[PDB]
Write a protein that binds this DNA or RNA. Structure first.
Ligand SMILES: [K+]
Ligand SMILES: [Mg+2]
Ligand SMILES: [Mg+2]
Ligand SMILES: [Mg+2]
Ligand SMILES: [Mg+2]
Ligand SMILES: [Mg+2]
Length: 95
RNA sequence: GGCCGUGUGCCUUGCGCCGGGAAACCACGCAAGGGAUGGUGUCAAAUUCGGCGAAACCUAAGCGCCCGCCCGGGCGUAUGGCAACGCCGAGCCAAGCUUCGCAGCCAUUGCACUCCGGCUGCGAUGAAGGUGUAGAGACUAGACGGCACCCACCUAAGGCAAACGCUAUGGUGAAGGCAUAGUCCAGGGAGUGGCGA
RNA sequence: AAGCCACACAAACCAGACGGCC
């Protein structure tokens, strides 16, 4: 239901039919009206397809995002989020 | 369409070998003989533009030699010619494989930051091979062609095996297609004339 | 020379390696 804090969040269950390039923008701002963003890495692999990694800058932006958007049916399809289990190779990269 | 020969290709055998492969086998120089050269299925597209190369075989302008002297001849000779055929650059190509994109759909609920699921179709693509390369050229097929598989035989790195050894993804099963089987038309057969020596 | 190129054309045959004999 919930997850441990993280400057980025994990979201699943989507209509991959979309364009990686496309979906990335259909989030770029879709998930940024309360905080900044770093990168919405997404893949189409038989593994990563159907999932994305919203990256913020501030924990809060995420703490909130994790709620101000959870369970929301994206493209006539629900949604599932969870703070990331491993702070992205961008944050844990620098700090 | 039979027999002799000439050249180029080709395989077999012998011999030589900086050589590639682990091995078989390929390659390369070369000499001599024509015994031997697997099967089914699939593809039929592109078939364009340029350039180098070239045996035998033809002809003898010039040159050399000779008929003692020019005239005229005779002898030798190819880079003049045909041509089996060896290839390059650029362009394009069926289906099979590379890899990228979209569509059925089949499956996926999957925690990542270096990409990448699977048949089917369309497009692009890359490495082969082909095309350019016939008697001018035109159209059909398919084989000796491309591709998949099967078989026979060879060696066995690797994987397997305690081990004698086992096994291909590897290798042998010619070349022909610079028109092969065909149907066309050319060309000669058999005219005229221009270049030419 | 050989050959080569134009327009013209009767056949069978020859004809897409060459030179010969039949
Ligand atoms: K072995
Ligand atoms: Mg050809
Ligand atoms: Mg052999
Ligand atoms: Mg021929
Ligand atoms: Mg023919
Ligand atoms: Mg020929």
């Amino acid at each position: 239901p919930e997850t441990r804090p993280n400057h980025t969040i994990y979201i699943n269950n989507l209509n991959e039919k979309i364009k990686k390039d496309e979906l990335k923008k259909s989030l770029h701002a879709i998930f940024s009206r309360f905080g900044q963003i770093l990168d919405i890495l997404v893949s189409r692999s038989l593994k990563m397809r159907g999932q994305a990694f919203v990256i913020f800058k501030e924990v809060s932006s995420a703490t909130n995002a994790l709620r101000s958007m959870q369970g929301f049916p994206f493209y006539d399809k629900p949604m599932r989020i969870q703070y990331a289990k491993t702070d992205s190779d961008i944050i844990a990269k620098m700090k």
